[PDB]
Structures are given as C-alpha cells and as structure tokens.
Amino acid sequence: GSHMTFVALYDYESRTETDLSFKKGERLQIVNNTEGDWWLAHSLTTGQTGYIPSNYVAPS
Ligand code: NI
Numbered sequence: 001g002s003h004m005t006f007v008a009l010y011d012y013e014s015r016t017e018t019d020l021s022f023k024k025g026e027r028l029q030i031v032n033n034t035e036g037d038w039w040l041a042h043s044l045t046t047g048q049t050g051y052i053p054s055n056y057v058a059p060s
Helices: none
Strands: 006-008 027-032 038-043 049-053 057-059
Touching: none
Parallel strands: none
Antiparallel strands: 006 027, 006 057, 027 038, 038 049
16 A cells, blocks of 8 residues: 555556556556556656556566
8 A cells, every 4th residue: 555566577658648658677656456457557766657557567
C-alpha cells in the first residue's frame, strides 16, 4: 500500500495521452491494478503518471 514499488524491465514510448512513457530501470508505484493487462502507474523516477503494460514491470 506504500511498501512496494516495481521496476521497469524495458523502455516504452506512449503515443496516447493516458499511457506512461518510461525507461528501463525506473522505479514505479502501481496506483490502479484493477485490470490485469494495463496498470495505472506513477514513476517516482520522472514524476509522470499513466497506464503501463503489466508485463513491462516486476516487483522491486
Ligand atoms: Ni505498500
């Protein structure tokens, strides 16, 4: 709930307004994981927020 972050495994570039662009290695908080495929994430590394593909991250 505040104890866990995820790490980005790969680079991803969004061309949609609601997806997050991020680089591998970024530290991400998962904000909304109600859906299995796409999670709302907040990057602590960039301060940006948006949906990410769930298979692009793993728990840190
Ligand atoms: Ni927590």
